Design a protein around this ligand. Structure first.
Ligand SMILES: [Mg+2]
Ligand SMILES: [Mg+2]
Ligand SMILES: [Mg+2]
Ligand SMILES: [N+]
Ligand code: NA
Ligand code: NA
Ligand code: NA
Length: 419
C-alpha cells in the first residue's frame, strides 16, 4: 500500500510516466473509496488501454481551461495542448499484443512475436472486450476533463499497430488497399467504409453512478461510445464522433450541449446513425441542446475519402432494444447538408426526413422536440412515417413532455436517490 494522494501527475518527469501506471498506483492507495484521486495528465499522445475499476477517479488535462481537444493531420495527430488516450483493436482481428484480459501488453507482444503465433483470440464485439474499448469505465464517480478518447481502428494506423502482428479472423472487413497488418504507420486507408467494423473508444459498464465528462472528445466510427444499462453518465460540452450507432447501449445518459459529428466517407453506403439505445425500462438518452454536424478534412479525417463540406445526411438513431429504448432530441440544431450531397441523398437537412430507422431492434420511444433546421426545412411530418406502434405523433412533440407525463429536464434523467 502507498499513501493517499489527492492529485497525481502523469508526464515524462511527473509522478507517473503512463496513465496506466497512475491508475495502478490508485489501486494500491490507502484511501477510502470516497476520497477522490485526480490524475493530472500532461498534454501528449498516450497509446494505452485502461480499465477504470477504482471509484471516484478523475482524468484531467493539465492544460486546464486552455486544453485543446483538436485533432490534426487528417486524424493522425493532436494539438500540443491535447491529451489523447488511444488504442486500436477492433472486431474481426486477433493481435499478438493482446493478453488474457483482452488488453495490450508489450511483454506478451514480445513473447508472441518470438513464438510466431498469438496467445489470445480476440472475441471482438460485445461485453467480453467492451467492443475493444480503449477506455472501459467500470467504477462509480468517474470524471474526465479535456481528454480525447479514441479508437484508431478506422482512423489511422498507429505506431503500436504497425509494430504489432495483426491477424484477420472471422468477420474481418477489408477493402482493396492492403490487409490491415501490411499497412504502414500513419496510413489513413482504414477510414474507408470497406475497412469499418465495431471499435469503441470509450465504454461504460452497467449499474454505475455519477459519471461526468466535461469538454472531452470521443473518436471512432462504428460503435464509438457504449454505456451499459442502469448507468448514469453526463457528457457536458463534449464532442462525440461516429458513423453507425456511435452512441449505443442502455445507459441513462445526458449529452448536454455536445457536438455530434458524423464521421463518414464519400462511399454511398457510409451513413451515420447517432444513437442505438438499449434500455429495457426506465429513462434513456437526453440529447439536450446538441449540434448535429460533421467532421472536417485535414484535421479530423483524410480528404481523399471526404470530399464535401459536410457528411452525407444521417439519422438520429436506430433503437437497439425494441419498444422500451428511449432517446430524446431536445432543442437540437441540425446543420444544412452540403448542397451536392443534399441532392444526391435527397435531404437538405443533415438528418434524413425519416429521422430514425427500425433496422436494428425495431421501433421504440424516440422523441424530437424543438429542432432548428439550419437548412430551413421542416421534416416533422415525415418522421418515422413507416412506423406503426410508435408513430410520428408520438415522436414529434409539441410540448416538452414524454409519454409518461415527465417534463423534459436534466433532472428527469438523473438518479432518483430513493430508487
Ligand atoms: Mg490498425
Ligand atoms: Mg464483419
Ligand atoms: Mg417540437
Ligand atoms: N479541429
Ligand atoms: Na488500467
Ligand atoms: Na464477437
Ligand atoms: Na501513432
Amino acid at each position: 500500500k502507498i499513501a493517499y494522494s489527492e492529485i497525481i501527475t502523469v508526464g515524462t518527469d511527473k509522478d507517473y510516466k503512463t496513465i496506466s501506471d497512475a491508475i495502478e498506483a490508485i489501486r494500491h492507495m490507502e484511501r477510502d473509496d470516497s476520497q477522490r484521486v485526480t490524475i493530472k495528465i500532461d498534454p501528449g499522445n498516450y497509446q494505452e488501454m485502461l480499465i477504470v475499476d477504482v471509484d471516484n477517479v478523475s482524468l484531467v488535462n493539465a492544460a486546464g481551461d486552455d486544453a485543446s481537444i483538436e485533432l490534426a493531420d487528417s486524424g493522425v495527430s493532436v494539438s500540443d495542448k491535447a491529451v489523447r488516450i488511444t488504442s486500436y483493436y477492433g472486431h474481426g482481428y486477433t493481435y499478438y499484443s493482446m493478453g488474457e484480459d483482452y488488453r495490450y501488453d508489450e511483454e506478451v507482444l514480445k513473447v508472441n512475436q518470438e513464438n510466431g503465433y498469438p496467445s489470445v483470440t480476440n472475441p471482438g464485439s460485445g461485453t467480453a472486450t467492451m467492443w475493444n474499448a480503449t477506455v472501459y469505465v467500470n467504477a462509480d464517480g468517474f470524471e474526465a476533463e479535456g481528454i480525447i478518447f479514441e479508437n484508431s481502428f478506422n482512423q489511422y494506423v498507429s505506431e503500436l499497430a504497425a509494430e504489432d502482428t495483426i491477424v484477420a479472423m472471422e468477420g474481418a472487413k477489408e477493402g482493396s488497399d492492403g490487409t490491415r497488418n501490411d499497412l504502414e504507420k500513419g496510413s489513413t486507408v482504414v477510414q474507408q467504409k470497406s475497412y469499418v467494423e465495431r471499435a469503441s473508444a470509450l465504454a461504460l459498464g452497467n449499474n454505475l453512478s455519477d459519471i461526468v465528462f466535461t469538454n472531452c472528445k470521443v473518436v471512432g466510427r462504428q460503435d464509438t461510445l457504449y454505456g451499459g444499462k442502469m448507468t448514469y453518465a453526463e457528457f457536458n460540452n463534449c464532442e462525440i464522433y461516429g458513423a453507425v450507432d456511435y452512441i449505443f447501449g442502455g445507459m441513462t445518459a445526458i449529452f448536454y450541449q455536445c457536438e455530434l459529428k458524423f464521421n463518414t466517407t464519400d462511399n454511398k453506403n457510409d451513413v451515420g446513425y447517432i444513437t442505438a439505445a438499449q434500455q429495457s425500462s426506465g429513462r434513456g438518452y437526453l440529447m439536450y441542446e446538441c449540434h448535429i454536424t460533421s467532421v472536417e478534412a485535414g484535421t479530423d479525417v483524410d480528404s481523399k475519402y471526404y470530399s464535401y463540406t459536410t457528411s452525407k445526411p444521417g439519422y438520429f438513431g436506430r433503437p437497439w432494444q425494441a419498444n422500451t429504448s428511449e432517446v430524446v432530441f431536445y432543442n437540437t440544431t441540425i446543420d444544412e447538408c452540403d448542397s451536392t450531397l443534399a441532392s444526391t441523398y435527397g435531404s437538405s437537412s443533415l438528418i434524413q426526413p425519416a429521422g430514425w430507422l427500425n433496422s436494428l431492434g425495431g421501433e421504440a420511444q424516440m422523441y424530437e422536440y424543438g429542432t432548428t433546421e439550419s437548412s430551413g426545412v421542416d421534416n416533422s411530418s415525415a418522421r418515422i412515417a413507416s412506423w406503426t406502434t410508435w408513430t410520428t405523433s408520438d415522436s414529434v412533440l409539441t410540448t416538452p413532455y414524454l409519454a409518461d407525463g415527465t417534463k423534459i429536464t436534466l433532472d428527469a434523467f438523473r438518479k432518483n436517490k430513493s430508487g
